[PDB]
Every structure is written in C-alpha cells, then in structure tokens.
Amino acid sequence: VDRWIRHAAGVERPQLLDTETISMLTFGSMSERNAAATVHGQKAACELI
Amino acid sequence: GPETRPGIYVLTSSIAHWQTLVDVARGKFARERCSFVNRRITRPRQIP
Amino acid sequence: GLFSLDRSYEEVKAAVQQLQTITFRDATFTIPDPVIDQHLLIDMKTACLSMSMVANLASELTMTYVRKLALEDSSMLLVKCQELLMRLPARPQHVSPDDEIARLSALFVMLRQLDDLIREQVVFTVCDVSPDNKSATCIFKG
Amino acid sequence: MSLQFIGLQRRDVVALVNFLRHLTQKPDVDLEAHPKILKKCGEKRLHRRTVLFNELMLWLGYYRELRFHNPDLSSVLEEFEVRCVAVARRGYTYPFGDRGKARDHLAVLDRTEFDTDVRHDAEIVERALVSAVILAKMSVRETLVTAIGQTEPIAFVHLKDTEVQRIEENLEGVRRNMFCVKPLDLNLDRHANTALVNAVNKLVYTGRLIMNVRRSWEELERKCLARIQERCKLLVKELRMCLSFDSNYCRNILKHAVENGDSADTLLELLIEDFDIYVDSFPQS
Amino acid sequence: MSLQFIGLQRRDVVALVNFLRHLTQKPDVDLEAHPKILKKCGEKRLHRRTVLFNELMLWLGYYRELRFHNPDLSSVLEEFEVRCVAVARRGYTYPFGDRGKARDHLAVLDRTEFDTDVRHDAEIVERALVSAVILAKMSVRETLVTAIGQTEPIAFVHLKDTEVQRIEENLEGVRRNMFCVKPLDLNLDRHANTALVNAVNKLVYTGRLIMNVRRSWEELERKCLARIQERCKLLVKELRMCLSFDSNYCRNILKHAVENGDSADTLLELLIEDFDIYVDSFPQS
C-alpha cells in the first residue's frame, strides 16, 4: 500500500540503496535539491484542514 | 588451552602508518593469530 | 573485488561501471584502472576474516533484534533496510549481563579491525575554509 | 460405513470389498487397470440408473481408501533432504571451467526447503533436478544445451544400457503403485564414475521417485472427481423421467456440488445411512 | 564358460557345476584350502594326461569366477570417504606444536579420492592412510620416527587389548572370506582422547579393511597364474612324446602366455570350440 501512496503523490523513495546520506536524511538535512530553473524565486505554501 | 601466556616484544620499524604496520605484523605472528580462532572453535560459550 | 570473485567476467564489467563512478558532493569522479592485486587479496583477507568472526561474536539478542523491532515499530529506515535481509511475544532464551557485556567488548575489536581498512590516516582538520575555496587552514598535519 | 448396492449378488460384493481391503497389495493400483471390476458392475444386464449407482458406490469407496491410506513421501523426503545439501558440499570442492555459472544451480539447492503444501512438491523436485543434471554435465565437460527456454531432460547419466533398463523399470511401477515402494537397487557407487556424479544419480533416483507419486496422486484424485460429476449429470436426467417420491428423494442428495472430496465425505455416509428409504426406486431382478 | 571333461562320472560333474553357485558361501576362499576338491581329480586312477588337464579346466574355472565376482567395494568403498571427511574436517581444528609441517599432512589427506581403475585404488589408501596415522600421534605428542628411510607401521592409538584381540579377527576373518562384506561398525567411539583422535581410529581401521581385501585379490589371481603356468609347462613334456595331428595340436594350445587377465581367459575360450578336435589323444575307460 505504501508503494501506491508514494506513486500517488509522485514522491520518490529516498534512494534505491542506503547511502550514509540516507541516514543523514533522518539526521536532519535539506532533503530537497534546488530546482534546475527558478524564474520566480523562493516558493512556499502550507496547509490547514 | 590451560593458560594464555603473554608474549611481549619490542619492535622498532621504519613503518609508521597503521595499515602498513599491521599487515607485515601478521607474517611474524601468524602462529599466535592461528591460536586465537582455534581457541574459539574448541570452546563454545567462551570468547577470548 | 568481492563481486569479481565467483561470477562471470562479463558480469564484472556491469558492476565495475556503476562502481567506478562517484557522484559524491556535486562533482563526479572516476577510478583509474582498479586492477585486482595481491594487495587487495590481503585487504580482502582481513575483511573476509572480520566477515566471519563478527557473526560468532554477535550476541543472540543482537542479530535477532532487527527482526523483532518490525513486529511493533515501523519507520522509513526499518523498511528500506529490511529488504536487503533474507526473508527469515517471546522470551529471550537467556540473559546474562556479565556474559553479554563481554560479548560486546570483543565485538568492538573486530569492528576496528574491519573498519580501518576503509579508514585512512587523517592528516588535516580544517577550520574556516577560505571563501575562494582555493585554500584552507589545517591542523594535525603529519 | 458398509457399501450398498441394488441387484448385485453377495458373491460379487465379496470380490469388490476384497479389492478395496488389499488395493495397495494388488499390482497396478488403478480402476482402468482392472476392467474386470467394471464387468462386475452388471453393465447392460441392469437398468442404466442402477449401472450409474453400482459405479458411484465404487468411485466413492475407491477415492475413500486413497484418502485413508495417503502416501508417505515425508519419509523418503527426509532422505532426499539429507542427500540434497550433501551434493552441494562436493560442488564447492570440485573446480569448474566457469566459477560463476556453478553457483547459479548450487544456490537454489542450498535454498531448499519443504513447505507443508504438497501441491508444490512437483515443482520443488523440478528445481532440484535443474540443479542436478546440469551440474553433473559440467563435471563430465560435455556441452549443455544452449537453446532458449529449453530445460535439460532429467535422466541417469553414463550408465550401461542394461543398467538404465533396470533402475528405470522400477519407476514404471511407482506410477502403478505409489504405496509399497520397493527400491533395493543400489550399485550406482563410483567404481568408474566421478563421486559427485554418483550422488546426482542417487539424487535423480529420489527425485523421479517423488514426481511419479505426486503426479499419480494428483492425477488419480483429479480423475475420480470428474467421473463422479459425470455420474450426477446423467443420473439427474435419468431420474427426471419419473416423479416418484423415492425417485425424487435421491435427487435432493445430489443437489450438493461435489467439488473436491470434501463434499464426497458427507455424500458417502449420507447416501448409505438413508439408503433404505429409496432402495426400491431402482428396478431389480 | 562351458567346462567339459573326459573321465569324470556324471556325479562328479554336478558337484563341480554346483561349485559355481556355491562359491560365495564357502568358508576359506582357496582351492589349496580345500584339498578334497583336488582329490576328485582322479590322480593315481587315470592317465596323467587326462589328470593334469583336469586341473586346468578347474583352475581356469576357479579363475573365471573370481574376476566375474569382483571385490564388493560397493557402499563400503564410499564409507571410507565418509569417515575420512570427518578426520579431514577436524584436522583444521585441534592445535599442534607445528604449523606448516602439519599443513601438508592435511591437504594431502584432502586430496584422497578413488581412481577409475580398480587396481590403482589401493595406491590412494596406501598413502592417505600413512598421512593420517602420523596426525593422531601429534595430538598425543607421541614420538615420531626420525631414522632415514623408514615408513611408520600402522598402529591404533590408545585402544584397549579387549578389542585388539577381536578386532584382528575381523581383519583376519574378512581375509578368510574376501567375498564377505562386513561393515564392522562396532562401538568404536570412546570417552578416551578426543573427538579428533577417536575419529582417527575409526578411519585407520577402515583403510586396513580395504588393504586386506585388495591384497587378497592379488593373493589368488597372481598365484593361480603361477600355478597354471606350472601345470602348463609340465604338460608340455608329456604331450610332446607322441607325434600325431591331435597330440601336436594340444601343444599349440599351451603356447599362449598364462600372464595377464584376458590372455589367460583366451586360453579357455579357444579350447571350448576346439574341444573335440584333439579329444582322441586322451585315453578313456
């Protein structure tokens, strides 16, 4: 069921294999890579049900 | 078996790096290295 | 060198290709001629020697512990690591704190025996890197 | 528990009951292997409704003795489990011309296990044979087949034609008799053949012994299940010709689906315990 | 194959025809050990030509059967590999006072096999056994020979005389009847010494069991050819005195060498079809 969930939102698995960065990913790090192009600059938007 | 004797040695060497030093060390001391695993297989529930 | 053993030489090229590349820290890297050598054969020897004894030094409550944590806790690291393992309440068979503390103390020695082969003699401990990234201060040199 | 029949004489029933009491002792354990038993049915001599019943009581009692006896593969399977991994240790000691290819079959043989499901046992032996004969050919250095999708045939290797004719002949009776296995054909030990090849020859001898029993058990059981429903599809229409109470009362027993032997286990005791009420429904004498 | 004789009575023939089927059960496997069979030759009661020739069909018949039976290496030859696998496995375990000297003793013990040739199988046991007995004394730190050129005689370590008085009888009783196949797996295990040293005594005894049957195989086959060659040359001077088409033809049959297996078997097969062409030379009644 978890495979269908990440595919539904499109979210990638952290990696196909466990690099030390993956343990660093749970240590607390900038998980997201910068976009290849950002004509609009910084982006943000939260959520409130 | 009955007792594990100490084996002191003084060993001057031009080697300084820890990796290169231990590798050549296993040639002269391979017999005692054989004794270590041998004590394990003979004695379950014993961990030298 | 482990994959090169026990497998077809044509299959080795498929593994050497993905392994020779290193994309670590932005810049790409590649290993020149990683020829198999007797220097690897002794390097594989100390790893193969540590590969076995750590399985003997490991406590029954140690190697089993990862399989038991999945029964209740669930997490990302627990799932991604569990797939690498082979597919296969309850009391511990025995708990001897003096016998168990001894099993761990010996286990650390083989790890240092195994970890050091990928370790290298550290030489620098840089503090404040220069903005140009063309120079940096260092300590502990030698 | 006793089988019921309409017009059959007591002299005929004794020949039939003894056929079931000692069916394992009899050569060729199959109903088609004994057409004379169907000549005891009273075929043509009696009405077609009764002919379906005299057979239906036999198919239920023939299937019942099979479920009651049940072949014991597990005893031979324990010997197969010991001979299995014992071949693998010889393979690590034996050099090959391609070190990587040899593990691909040895790794499957080291993975061997026996799940409680007997349905997969015909498949468990197959990978045990793919790990066997393909490995033995590498020791002989004879070329393996390279055709895509073509698993190698499984048979004894490098035996004399008189020798192949003998040990293989026992397997033909293993299909005819899955119960009273009688091996005692032991002279495959090296003398001339390589020692790793000899364990593979004993390994195939165990694997052929398993597949012949599991296939005959799957076949004879699947065969009787089809024959029982064929008795029902005809009898329900033959009983449609009359609307008498006893003629209709039998149809209610047949309403059950006879999938597997599970419904037959209820169908048999129910048909016998209440047989007296409709015994006159079938014409006799 | 088809033995034939001149002066023997029909009652003497049935006793010899039964000797083929009954040879396996007979105590003391030696025609010299059963003089009464040789007293049936009719010596000092018939002409010397028929008498000396009478033994030749019997000695060749005694020779044709021994090769036909073959020593029953069967599972017992495989059993030597089983106990050898245990001593070879524990030789990597127990510490010794050396390292590289015992290292060669273990690898040569791991090289033991069984050749496709039957005669050469003794050569593997002849060397692998001596390498194993030396290893057992090293666990005891028992003195080993240092004198030049001497091989250590086989000798069990730390075994009581209560078994030594009987265990030699098994080595002699199997020598008394080479056809017999006794596994002789008694309670060899003991609380004394250790699992390694006890495994050695179980293994060293298995090599003596093979060496005794193997030397017995040449104890007769090499000996009977020396006897047939002795009976042959003595027959030449007797047949030579007469000049006839049959008396000269009998000398030609003896020209073939007694040596080697098939060359000795050729002496009988040539004589079977040609038995009647020279029969007139031998007086009867």
Per CB-CB distance under 8 Å, the chain C contacts of B19 are: 116-117, 120-121
CB atoms closer than 10 angstroms to residue E285: 5
Terminal alpha carbon distance of chain D: 25
Residues of A in contact with C76 (CB under 8 A): 14, 26
Q: Would you call D189 and E75 a contact, using CB atoms and an 8 Å cutoff?
A: yes
- Cα separation, E60 vs E16, in Å, equals 13
Distances (CA, A) of E209 to D37, E77, E182, E185, E216: 57, 10, 9, 11, 11
- CA dist D144 and D132 (Å) reads 13
8 A C-beta contact, residue A26 and residue C77: yes
Cα dihedral: E78, E84, E88, E93 (round 10): 130
What is the enclosing helix (H) or strand (E) of E225? helix E195-240
Got the DSSP string for E43-91? TTTS-HHHHHHHHHHHHHHHHHHHHHH----HHHHHHHHHHHHHHHHHT
Of B17, B23, B48, the CB nearest to C42: B23
Cα dihedral: C22, C25, C28, C34 (round 10): -30
Helix (H, G, I), strand (E, B) or coil at E204: helix
Does an H or E element contain B1, and which?
none
DSSP E281: G
Q: For chain D, give the secondary structure using H, E and C.
A: CCCCCCCCCHHHHHHHHHHHHCCCCCCCCCCCCCHHHHHCCCCCCCCHHHHHHHHHHHHHHHHHHHHHHCCCHHHHHHHHHHHHHHHHHHHHHCCCCCHHHHHHHHHHHHCCCCCCCCCCHHHHHHHHHHCCHHHHHHHHCCCCCCCCCCCCCCCCCCCCHHHHHHHHHHHHHHHHCCCCCCCCCCCCCCCCCCHHHHHHHHHHHHHHHHHHHHHHHHHHHHHHHHHHHHHHHHHHHHHHHCCCHHHHHHHHHCCCCCCCCHHHHHHHHHHHHCHHHHHHHCCCC
Residues of E engaging D, defined by a Cβ cutoff of 8 Å: 73-75, 77-78, 81, 113-114, 116, 118
Q: How many CA atoms lie within 13 A of B3 on its CB side?
A: 3
Helix (H) or strand (E) holding E222: helix E195-240
How would DSSP label each residue in chain C? -TTTTTS-HHHHHHHHHHHHEE--SSS-EE-S-----HHHHHHHHHHHHHHHHHHHHS-HHHHTHHHHHTTT---HHHHHHHTTS-------S---HHHHHHHHHHHHHHHHHHHTTT---------SB-TTSS-B---S--
Q: How far apart are CA E159 and CA E115, in angstroms?
A: 32
What DSSP designation does E24 have? T
CB contact (8 A) between residue B41 and residue E93: yes
Q: Which amino acid is at D30?
A: D
The residue written with tokens 């296995």 in the block is: D181
Tell me which chain C residues have a C-beta less than 8 angstroms from the C-beta of B37: 53
CA distances from E284 to E5, E37, E56 (A): 11, 21, 18
d(CA D139, CA D143): 10
Amino acid occupying residue E205 = Y
* Polymer length of chain C: 142
Pair of tokens at residue D165? 């004719």
Task: Give the chain A residue nearest C23 (alpha carbons).
Answer: A19
- Residue E141: DSSP 8-state: T
Alpha carbons within 13 angstroms on the beta-carbon side of residue C84 total: 8
Count Cβ–Cβ pairs < 8 Å, chain C vs chain D. 10
Which residues in chain C have their CB less than 8 angstroms from residue B45's CB? 99
**How many angstroms from the chain centroid is the CA of residue D159?**
28
Answer whether E259's CB lies under 8 Å from E225's CB: yes
Rounded Cα gap, residues E26 and E23, in angstroms = 5
> Resolution in A for the shown PDB structure?
3.9
- Please state, in angstroms and rounded to a whole number, the distance separating the CA atoms of residues D197 and E81: 15
Which two tokens mark D130? 């793919």
Strand C29-30, strand C21-22: pairing: antiparallel
Asked if the Cβ–Cβ distance from A2 to C79 is below 8 Å, we say: yes
**What is the spatial distance between Cα E222 and Cα D95, in angstroms, rounded to a whole number?**
39
C7–D contact, CB cutoff 8 A: yes
Backbone conformation region of residue D121, classed left if phi is above 0, alpha if psi is from -120 to 50, else beta: alpha
Instruction: Report the alpha-carbon distance of residue D271 to residue E172 in Å, rounded.
Output: 71
Tell me if D100 sits within 8 A of C11, measured CB to CB.
yes
- Subunits next to B (3 or more Cβ pairs <8 Å) are C, E
- Collapsing DSSP to helix, strand or coil, E230 comes out as helix
- In the block, residue with structure tokens 């030093």: B21
Mark D118-138 as b/e (b = at least 16 C-beta within 10 Å): beebeebbeebbbbbbbbbbb
User: What kind of experiment solved this structure?
Assistant: cryo-EM
Whole-angstrom distance, CA of residue E129 vs CA of residue E84: 10
Contact by Cβ (8 Å): D213, D71: yes
CA distance C139 to C126: 7
Nearest CA in chain D to E110: D93
User: What is the number of other CB atoms lying within 10 angstroms of the CB of residue E207?
Assistant: 23
What is the distance between the alpha carbons of residues D105 and D97, in angstroms, rounded to a whole number?
A: 15
Q: Give the residue carrying structure tokens 């009899």.
A: D26
How far does the CA of residue D99 sit from the closest CA of chain C (Å)? Answer: 5
Q: Where are the alpha helices (DSSP H) in E100-194?
A: 100-110, 121-140, 161-176
CA–CA distance, D275 with D93 (Å, rounded to integer): 68
B41 interaction partners in chain E (CB closer than 8 Å): 93
Rounded-to-integer distance, Cα E79 and Cα E72, Å: 13
For residue C6 the two structure tokens come to: 């026990």
d(CA E245, CA E239): 12
For residue B4, the 8-state DSSP code is: -
Token code pair at residue E28: 């003391």
Burial class of residue D102 in the structure, from the number of CB atoms within 10 Å of its CB (0-12 exposed, 13-18 middle, 19+ buried): buried
Interatomic CA distance for residues E16 and E57, integer angstroms: 11
Distance between CA atoms of residues E156 and D127, nearest Å = 46
What whole-number distance in Å separates Cα of residue E36 and Cα of residue E31? 9
Structure tokens at E20: 């083929």
Cβ neighbours, 10 Å, residue D209: 22
* Distance between CA atoms of residues D219 and D178, nearest Å: 12
Which residues fall within 8 angstroms of residue D233, CB to CB, at 6 or more apart? none
D99 touches chain C (CB under 8 A): yes
Q: Which residue of B has its CA nearest to C41?
A: B23
- 10 Å CB burial of residue D214 (0-12, 13-18, 19+) is buried
Counting Cβ atoms within 10 Å, is residue D50 exposed (0-12), middle (13-18) or buried (19+)? buried
**DSSP conformational letter for E10:** H
Q: How far is CA C75 from CA A31, C69, C80, D141, D174, in A?
A: 17, 10, 9, 51, 54
Q: How far apart are CA E138 and CA E141, in angstroms?
A: 4
Place of tokens 């008085």: E165
Burial (CB count within 10 angstroms: exposed 0-12, middle 13-18, buried 19+), residue E238: middle
| Structural tokens at position D2 | 């006793």
Q: Touching check for D97 and chain C: CB below 8 Å?
A: no
Residue with tokens 């023997």: E8
- Cα angle for residues D15, D17, D19 (degrees, 5° grid): 70
In chain D, which residues have their Cβ closer than 8 Å to the Cβ of E77? Answer: 189-191
Cβ atoms of residues C47 and C117 within 8 Å: yes
Kindly state the tokens that stand for D159: 């035996």
Containing E26, the helix (H) or strand (E) segment is none
Report yes or no: D114 and D181 within 8 Å, Cβ to Cβ.
Answer: no
Q: Which residues contact C97 (CB under 8 A, 6 or more apart)?
A: none
Partner-chain contact B40 C56, CB within 8 Å: yes
Beta-bridge mates of residue C132? none
SS (H, E, C) E232-256: HHHHHHHHHCCCCHHHHHHHHHCCC
Provide CB contacts within 8 A for D36, sequence distance 6+.
none
Contact status, residue E157 vs residue E201, Cβ threshold 8 Å: yes
CB contact under 8 A, C11 and D99: no
At CA C123, angle to CA C119 and CA C129, rounded to 5? 115
Q: What type of residue is C70?
A: A
Six token digits for residue B30: 């391979």
